[PDB]
Amino acid sequence: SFAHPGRGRNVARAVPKGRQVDPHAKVEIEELLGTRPRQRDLLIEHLHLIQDTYGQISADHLAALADEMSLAFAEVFETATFYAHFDVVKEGEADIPRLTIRVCDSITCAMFGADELLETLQRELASDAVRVVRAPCVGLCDHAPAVEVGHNFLHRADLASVRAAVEAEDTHAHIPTYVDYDAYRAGGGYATLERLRSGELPVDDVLKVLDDGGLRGLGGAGFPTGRKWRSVRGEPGPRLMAVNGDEGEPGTFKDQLYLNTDPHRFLEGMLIGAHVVEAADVYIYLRDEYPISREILAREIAKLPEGTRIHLRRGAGAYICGEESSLIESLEGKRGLPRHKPPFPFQVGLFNRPTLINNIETLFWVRDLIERGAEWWKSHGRNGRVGLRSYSVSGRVKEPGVKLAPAGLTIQELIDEYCGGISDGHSFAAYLPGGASGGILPASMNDIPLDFGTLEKYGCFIGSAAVVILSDQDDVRGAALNLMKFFEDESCGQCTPCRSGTQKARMLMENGVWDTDLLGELAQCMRDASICGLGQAASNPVSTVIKYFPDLFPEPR
Amino acid sequence: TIAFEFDGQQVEAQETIWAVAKRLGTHIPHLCHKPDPGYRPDGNCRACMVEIEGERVLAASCKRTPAIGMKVKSATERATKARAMVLELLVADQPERATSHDPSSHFWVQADVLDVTESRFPAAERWTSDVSHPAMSVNLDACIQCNLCVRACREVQVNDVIGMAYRAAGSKVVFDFDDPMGGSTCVACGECVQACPTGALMPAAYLDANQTRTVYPDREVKSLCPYCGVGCQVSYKVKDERIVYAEGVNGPANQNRLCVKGRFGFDYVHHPHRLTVPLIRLENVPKDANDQVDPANPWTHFREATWEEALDRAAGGLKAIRDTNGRKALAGFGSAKGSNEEAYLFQKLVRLGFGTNNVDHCTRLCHASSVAALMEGLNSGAVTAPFSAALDAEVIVVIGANPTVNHPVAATFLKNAVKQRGAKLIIMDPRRQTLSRHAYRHLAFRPGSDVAMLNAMLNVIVTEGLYDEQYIAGYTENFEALREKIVDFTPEKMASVCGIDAETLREVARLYARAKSSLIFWGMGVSQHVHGTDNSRCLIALALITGQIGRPGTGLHPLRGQNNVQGASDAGLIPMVYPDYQSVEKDAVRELFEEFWGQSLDPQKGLTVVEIMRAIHAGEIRGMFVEGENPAMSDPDLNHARHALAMLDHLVVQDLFLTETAFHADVVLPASAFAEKAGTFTNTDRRVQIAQPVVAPPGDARQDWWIIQELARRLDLDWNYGGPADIFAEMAQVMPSLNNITWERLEREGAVTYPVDAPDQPGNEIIFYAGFPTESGRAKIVPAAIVPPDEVPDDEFPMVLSTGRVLEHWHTGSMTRRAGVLDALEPEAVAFMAPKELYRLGLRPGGSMRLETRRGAVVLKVRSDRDVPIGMIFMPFCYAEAAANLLTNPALDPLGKIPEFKFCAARVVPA
Ligand SMILES: Nc1nc2c(c(=O)[nH]1)N[C@H]1C(S)=C(S)[C@@H](COP(=O)(O)OP(=O)(O)OC[C@H]3O[C@@H](n4cnc5c(=O)[nH]c(N)nc54)[C@H](O)[C@@H]3O)O[C@H]1N2
Ligand SMILES: Nc1nc2c(c(=O)[nH]1)N[C@H]1C(S)=C(S)[C@@H](COP(=O)(O)OP(=O)(O)OC[C@H]3O[C@@H](n4cnc5c(=O)[nH]c(N)nc54)[C@H](O)[C@@H]3O)O[C@H]1N2
Ligand SMILES: Cc1cc2nc3c(=O)[nH]c(=O)nc-3n(C[C@H](O)[C@H](O)[C@H](O)COP(=O)(O)O)c2cc1C
Ligand code: SF4
Ligand code: SF4
Ligand code: SF4
Ligand code: SF4
Ligand code: FES
Ligand code: FES
Ligand SMILES: [W+6]
């Protein structure tokens, strides 16, 4: 019995510092991973694998997973909590209910009553066995209001059909009928690609057809696809390719359409690009909200002969992962934080290798542009523009949906010639030419050709051509608030003008009166100092609403 | 040089735009950019934007380097509007400056340059306080999400505690799974709070119960760290003559990096138990092995006395034993925590005043077996490369050392090397380490089988023709002895002895030999065995036959543990050599010093630390002088060691507190602490660094050198030094290693690696590039057989007891248990066992248990640690309530004279 110089008024930790790894959760995650690689760039997939198996990511599983992958606790927690679809449950936290119901609250579904539907589905159905939550646009705006029950997306949903899907345990995704490998080959599929590969079709011929056709980035930025392809292949190898299937832009849904109808057309246009730039592996990054598209691509990639390795990856609820550098970061198993330019992805991208990145739709058209030539593509067009373009039209139209139509249509032409005009009892008031990011234009400016370039004069851009039509029954200022709420949630948090700016603007826009001057100074700062295009375009709704709808600000400054 | 235009003027760079502007006198606001080494810019805060003509959008001047023909404008309305707007965005969430967590933060400074005093944006209600950690307060409502702390924790230190979780404005700094900082893996290194520009992270010492800052120190003093051999340079914050906080300074070894003991364990100098007057044991109070004194109440055993009387009885008792029983009945234990000048005086006092070579210090229980083999093969008593050489190493070997616990700042550079350069780290240690997560391989071999494992790797390199014949031809000897004897130690046969499968042994041997540069670290796991000299020989043999030495990123680095163990040995504080390792038994050496000191010296080498303990039991050693050593806790087999101290006719102890050793003392002399002295100190890299006093000693404590001179005068030695400078001047004339190193040079340069060739050039960090200081210039390889431990487990004692260290505590605990933060972090005696073993004994984690060996028994808590192998008990020796050295086996390595602290047999019974 010996004294000691310490204070003697504290007790030592029974265990080492921090939280510990549980032996049962370690055994369970050992069993769950099987022989899958414990490499870092599979972190998001293994988090999908714990969430899909157990319905949640408990901390005891998260800790076993970081230990199995040699990662720090903060690295896995950092990454997991970045993505909206991962439920991390700590000590003292309840478990996630067995069934999850997600109700979209983006602009189009909100126009058809999404907020009230969320409240109604919450009072009537939420319980210990059902969780009811909001979600951003899930690419079903032509079926607004969209609601997800498990992995089953209900179109034009109400309480009756969602109640019927729950009580029927109707929670799996319904796979439609599509053009499969046998049917695709019977229509001459995988012919242009094989001629390109074998040697008869020269690679320089492919690059020439693209430059002549003028195929531009259908993901929204409109960069010339041939110019990009030459740039990637003009870089020292090894090179890689990544397919952007995030389609997270509210109002956009053309990629989901082409995937669920004719997937191998996209797969061949992809494998063509993979051959032009000599990519060892291709990565398809499909957003989590497309489980129908996920099962279709899983089935059809397996039907392909054994060539280029195709890695199908799965998003986890994050609109920022549609930015090329953020998608790359997400593919490497990290938080989706955009990188700083320069360098650009075509030179230092996925795994610091020169990386070719293309949108689902851009690759979809490669096969046809080659077999039919550039002059067939440039034959279509309107008002001085050339080429085809897929417009995702939602809102107050009689016939919403993807409209493959000539580039350069006016919004008046796109609505009367392709969408049956405005809905019954609505008058054309405003439209979003480029989804959330492209700003809000009034109905009186309906004579502006819609294509890359034509809208910048007006502070807008066509972007992904997510066309949303609003009417006099809709609220234009409430439209811009819904878009700011979206960006405030989607902002990856990296930099001040976007992280704080989106939040500050949303807070200001909820006052009865808008302080347009302060929003003006902030908008200027956001597009001038934000790192990436999310913050650079987040204020585009507010700026255009202030400029093009003076009647919506009666009060004096 | 890149010439470009900046704000209308032609300038030249190299360096980013921000850095050019700072150097031209144009300060550009910056928050997430920390212009200090190791903090690579991130460009997230956007406070530093500039206008680059011809570019659509503004650029962050901290991220962008200039280009030829670049027009950069920082004073444009457009650029200054964006910067002030960024600051206005952040000021909206900041707590009111006057009562904030840091009203004079770097953030508010940048706010004041943009004249952003208020924000017209609404505030967001954010996170609440986190004060669970006793050293640091977390108040994230001042956080700007600049991730300086994240880089601090995950790039500079690579402690890997902090993260930036969630998304958008919910992006939050978190510890592990957003756990409380005080219940997380945080090691309290303080890198994050030193980097934080907002006060969101602050030293707890600075804030009141409302998390408002209250402590603004009067002054700061640059000095060193009193603890370990990394030699970190430190800035000490003094408020009203009290050290209140400490920061990292850009010293050669540490680059502003610290660990918890350097940043927070400074307050032992202010502890109420600090000795302030001399003590003389009461004339009627006898000595006993198990007798305890109360450090707060020594009047039960001691009387207070003047310096004149305490020194008279201190020297008088030693002088009576010398003059009656002879010089042979005295011995001295020096301090490897003191300065080089004090070690030189102490060894001089024992040799000139006691008349013997019975002088030693804690290096006898430390790297004695390592330096024995290094002298035997290289004639060297120091490392061949700095620990910063790990950054140039392709393969890093850490064997028998736990650097993230015991040399943390150095360990941050080995983790940097893995993360930034792709070094392949191989850890060899029975226990798993926190370092193991970054390692390419971790061999968790059986305790006590280094020779078996390392001889397998020499067998792989020698049989597969992986050695460097050019180097073996030019610079080694005795390599043929190794080929003939190494044949029986095959990976297949040695796999069962060390527990490492034979294929991993070959892979490690192939990897080490084929690397372009390989660097070996080792510590007490290698040296503290009855075969520790053999463990070292195998390591040297690995470096000699592969030529992995003498080049950048290569060599042999036995991690020197004490803050001046290397310097105290340089100054001759060991029984067999004068300063600079000159044999006392070489008549030519003895005659040199006899003329330089003016008296005949003993030609026979003295005894070692444990050999003096035994001589005391034989009644041969009767008086001792102990300064800055606590053998009543640090010596093995304490029941016997404390009994030896109880039998001394006369024990003088010079220390800061009434330690377990001073219990048995006849005279206690209150001494100055590190932060109160000036002098030189030699780190593990041979960097000689000068220290200067931060505060004055309390009461009547005196300078160590002064007390040594006062005892020396009373032993007929006419010394009259003025201080450390005058002593350093005398050492330089007998220490060639100090050539071109002068006190003036260290005062202006701070640190100088030795040996130096010129008073202006830097020192030779890497040595042995062109041969060794042996006779032939070559290094002798010395084969090694498998020696068993002195004590091995049987049925009565089925467990292997190993002893060692924890991050927050130092050796015997006499200093760190008196530092408030370190004592709150590790307040109670614990030993570590595997969970499976706790199950078999029916113990729960935190339960009490009895730990017994043939030599002693203790009762303490058990901490459950899966990184501890089955059949092993690991126990720090820092807890007087359950002193590990009551259990340890005092068996000595015959060549090094070091005990086997790392291996004995023990048994556990629940208590
Ligand atoms: N925080 C802190 N740091 C210190 C000190 C302190 O007291 N507290 N002391 C300082 C001192 S003076 C010194 S010399 C250094 C010590 O520095 P270290 O050598 O790192 O100290 P130990 O904890 O004893 O580490 C020895 C390691 O070898 C392992 N080991 C056990 N048995 C064997 C074996 O048989 N073979 C091999 N190869 N390894 C084995 C043990 O697991 C242990 O992790 O630290 C200094 N640094
Ligand atoms: N079981 C086991 N035993 C071990 C070891 C192990 O690993 N396992 N390690 C061994 C090791 S490597 C060694 S180095 C020894 C360490 O053996 P010790 O040196 O005896 O341990 P310390 O606590 O460092 O002793 C330093 C003492 O000097 C006091 N002091 C501090 N600063 C000053 C100063 O500036 N001036 C003066 N006059 N006094 C000061 C301190 O209060 C302290 O009492 O322990 C060894 N013993
Ligand atoms: C915030 C942000 C979100 C984006 N989201 C998407 C998306 O959902 N789908 C997409 O194909 N491109 C998106 N992009 C464009 C991509 O960064 C990139 O240009 C594209 O994936 C490849 O271009 P391509 O159109 O030339 O194929 C986004 C860009 C930023 C501004
Ligand atoms: S803008 Fe800044 S914050 Fe918003 S997403 Fe791009 S990087 Fe992250
Ligand atoms: S804590 Fe200090 S450092 Fe870490 S992010 Fe918040 S502000 Fe930057
Ligand atoms: S203190 Fe050292 S360890 Fe704890 S968080 Fe800050 S940096 Fe990471
Ligand atoms: S590392 Fe060794 S020296 Fe540097 S601070 Fe921590 S203890 Fe002091
Ligand atoms: S799905 Fe609800 S907005 Fe597109
Ligand atoms: S300082 Fe240039 S961006 Fe943070
Ligand atoms: W030591």
Numbering used by the authors:
A (entry chain B): 10 to 315, 317 to 567
B (entry chain A): 69 to 82, 85 to 981
Provide the publication's sentences verbatim.
Formate de­hydrogenases (FDHs) catalyze the two-electron oxidation of formate to carbon dioxide and play an important role in several kingdoms of organisms. The second class of enzymes is metal-dependent (Mo- or W-containing) FDHs from prokaryotic organisms, which belong to the superfamily of molybdenum enzymes and are members of the di­methyl­sulfoxide (DMSO) reductase family. The metal-containing formate de­hydrogenase 1 from M. extorquens AM1 (MeFDH1) comprises two subunits and is located in the cytoplasmic fraction.
Recently, we successfully determined the structure of MeFDH1, a W–Cys-type enzyme, by means of cryo-EM and X-ray crystallography. MeFDH1 consists of two subunits denoted α and β [Fig. 1(a)]. The α subunit contains the W–Cys active site with the proximal [4Fe–4S] cluster, along with an additional two [4Fe–4S] clusters and one [2Fe–2S] cluster. The β subunit harbors the binding site for NAD+ and possesses one FMN cofactor, one [4Fe–4S] cluster and one [2Fe–2S] cluster. The [4Fe–4S] cluster in the β subunit is connected to the [4Fe–4S] and [2Fe–2S] clusters in the α subunit with distances of 14.9 and 10.9 Å, respectively. The β subunit is responsible for catalyzing the NAD+/NADH redox couple in MeFDH1 and is therefore called the diaphorase unit. The structure of W–Cys-type MeFDH1 is also very similar to that of Mo–Cys-type RcFdsGBACD [RcFDH homologously expressed in R. capsulatus with operon fdsGBACD], although the orientation of the β subunit with respect to the α subunit is slightly different. The cryo-EM structure of Mo–Cys-type RcFdsGBACD revealed that the Mo ion was coordinated by six ligands of the bis-MGD cofactor, the cysteine sulfur and a sulfido ligand with similar geometry to the other FDHs. The recent structural analysis of W–Cys-type MeFDH1 in the oxidized state showed, however, that the six ligands coordinated to the W ion were those from the bis-MGD, a cysteine sulfur and a tentative oxygen species based on the coordination bond lengths. A highly conserved lysine residue (K44 in EcFDH-F and K331 in MeFDH1) is located between the pterin cofactor and the proximal [4Fe–4S] cluster.
